[PDB]
Amino acid sequence: CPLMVKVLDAVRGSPAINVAMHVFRKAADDTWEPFASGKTSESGELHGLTTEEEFVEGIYKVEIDTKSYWKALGISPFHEHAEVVFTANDSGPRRYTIAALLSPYSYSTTAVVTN
Amino acid sequence: CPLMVKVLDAVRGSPAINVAMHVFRKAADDTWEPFASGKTSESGELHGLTTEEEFVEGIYKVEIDTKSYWKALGISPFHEHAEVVFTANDSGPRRYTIAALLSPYSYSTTAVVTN
Amino acid sequence: CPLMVKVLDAVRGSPAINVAMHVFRKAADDTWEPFASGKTSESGELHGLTTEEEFVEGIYKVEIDTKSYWKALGISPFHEHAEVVFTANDSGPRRYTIAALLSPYSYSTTAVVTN
Amino acid sequence: CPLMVKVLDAVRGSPAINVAMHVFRKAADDTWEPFASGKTSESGELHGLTTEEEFVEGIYKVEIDTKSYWKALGISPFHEHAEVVFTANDSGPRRYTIAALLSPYSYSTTAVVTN
Numbered sequence: 311c312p313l314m315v316k317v318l319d320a321v322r323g324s325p326a327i328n329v330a331m332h333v334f335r336k337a338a339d340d341t342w343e344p345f346a347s348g349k350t351s352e353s354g355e356l357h358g359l360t361t362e363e364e365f366v367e368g369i370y371k372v373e374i375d376t377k378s379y380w381k382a383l384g385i386s387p388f389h390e391h392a393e394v395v396f397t398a399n400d401s402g403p404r405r406y407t408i409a410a411l412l413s414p415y416s417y418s419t420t421a422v423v424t425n
Numbered sequence: 426c427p428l429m430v431k432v433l434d435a436v437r438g439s440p441a442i443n444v445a446m447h448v449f450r451k452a453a454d455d456t457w458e459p460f461a462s463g464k465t466s467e468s469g470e471l472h473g474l475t476t477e478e479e480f481v482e483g484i485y486k487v488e489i490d491t492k493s494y495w496k497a498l499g500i501s502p503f504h505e506h507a508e509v510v511f512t513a514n515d516s517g518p519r520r521y522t523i524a525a526l527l528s529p530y531s532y533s534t535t536a537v538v539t540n
Numbered sequence: 541c542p543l544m545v546k547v548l549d550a551v552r553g554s555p556a557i558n559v560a561m562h563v564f565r566k567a568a569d570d571t572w573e574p575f576a577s578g579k580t581s582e583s584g585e586l587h588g589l590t591t592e593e594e595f596v597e598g599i600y601k602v603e604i605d606t607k608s609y610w611k612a613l614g615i616s617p618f619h620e621h622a623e624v625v626f627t628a629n630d631s632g633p634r635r636y637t638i639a640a641l642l643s644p645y646s647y648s649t650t651a652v653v654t655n
Numbered sequence: 656c657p658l659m660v661k662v663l664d665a666v667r668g669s670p671a672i673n674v675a676m677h678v679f680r681k682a683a684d685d686t687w688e689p690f691a692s693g694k695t696s697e698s699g700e701l702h703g704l705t706t707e708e709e710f711v712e713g714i715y716k717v718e719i720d721t722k723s724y725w726k727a728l729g730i731s732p733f734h735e736h737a738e739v740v741f742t743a744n745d746s747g748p749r750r751y752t753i754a755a756l757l758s759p760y761s762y763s764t765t766a767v768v769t770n
């Protein structure tokens with residue numbers, strides 16, 4: 311599993327379940343092409359987005375639909391989505407965990423990259 | 426000043442100085458049109474981006490060039506940029522501070538929205 | 541003002557107002573003796589805690605009463621308080637801002653140390 | 656496993672390995688009594704601190720030795736340690752994950768609490 315996303319809720323102290331996200335990859339003409347999508351499970355994790363062979367070098371964007379998550383809890387949040395943009399596999403294959411910790415007016419994001 | 430951006434450095438414990446950013450407004454065709462830009466001051470702040478009359482309701486994106494900031498310090502970063510995407514909404518007189526706290530492999534962002 | 545504390549609310553997107561805190565200095569017997577205290581202003585800031593002559597090198601603890609803050613808003617919090625423990629070190633003229641960003645089940649803290 | 660701690664490094668984008676921590680429990684006389692201790696593994700996780708039977712209701716403090724972690728990487732950090740203080744099991748047994756994301760001048764901490 312070369313790309314995994316984990317989302318947590320800082321209001322409830324829980325995984326953020328059923329959070330939709332779309333992953334894009336920058337094409338040679340500089341447009342964002344669709345790459346993969348899914349939603350977080352009961353553990354707040356989304357696995358199985360891609361494979362080692364498909365996940366080539368490139369610039370990737372993870373767009374996490376945080377607005378819909380908060381609205382369903384009755385909260386009108388500040389952000390439209392959380393966006394994570396990064397170059398992947400520039401020095402050979404790596405495994406990436408993208409994580410986001412969500413509050414209505416704030417989020418933190420980090421990456422855990424392993425060889 | 427209806428919109429201000431403040432950027433801090435979590436490695437050095439300091440304002441993040443000379444950080445470039447662009448602000449975009451989402452257009453009717455879902456493209457991002459440039460709206461304002463600048464570099465943070467010695468206090469890590471960027472003022473004077475817009476005026477009350479120009480800053481109408483809509484979806485805005487602040488793209489902060491965090492990669493160039495870390496490269497200037499000789500530190501390898503994860504993100505291509507930090508992206509803050511939000512809806513501006515008219516409910517009473519409001520001033521928006523977008524703040525970002527930067528680390529090489531992580532960032533936190535919040536909004537301080539006041540009257 | 542050699543020491544200032546700023547507290548923000550990540551649920552409401554606002555300064556955290558009327559947040560009580562105590563500052564302690566570590567004594568020779570490893571106990572915490574009271575040093576200063578106050579409540580945050582409408583800007584979420586607490587100024588005037590100490591003076592340059594009083595704020596000598598040593599280990600200091602800021603204990604922020606985040607539990608009472610969340611209880612006043614009717615939101616169940618995780619932490620008893622937020623604790624920030626640091627060493628003050630003399631290397632040139634330095635001013636310390638301790639900042640805390642609060643959510644019910646999470647907090648972030650940073651230091652902005654300037655000349 | 657009713658109490659687990661996970662520590663990540665926001666500079667390197669990696670687990671924080673070999674981070675020492677001590678857990679204390681508030682006694683009836685209001686002193687902090689030693690409860691458990693350990694260090695994080697190669698995954699940045701510390702498991703096996705306690706058992707369901709030993710982990711009774713109370714106020715617990717996790718003291719994470721972040722200063723030694725940074726010093727061994729050549730970094731002189733701001734904080735002496737990260738302190739996480741919380742009431743546990745007040746409504747019956749729960750499983751707690753305490754997490755900390757570390758930078759030299761900043762850290763974020765959250766909790767994931769499950770029934």
Ligand SMILES: CCc1oc2c(F)ccc(F)c2c1C(=O)c1cc(I)c(O)c(I)c1
Binds near residue numbers: 433522526637640650
């Ligand atoms: C994401 C940016 C951020 O991180 C924080 C944190 F981790 C703890 C406390 C904080 F206030 C913040 C903070 C801020 O928004 C911020 C900091 C200062 I100094 C300000 O003067 C203003 I206005 C805003």
Ligand SMILES: CCc1oc2c(F)ccc(F)c2c1C(=O)c1cc(I)c(O)c(I)c1
Binds near residue numbers: 316411421422
């Ligand atoms: C931005 C997301 C985030 O915030 C953190 C924080 F504030 C403190 C400590 C942290 F580990 C994190 C964290 C994580 O990356 C994370 C949390 C868990 I639980 C995991 O199992 C995995 I894999 C990753």
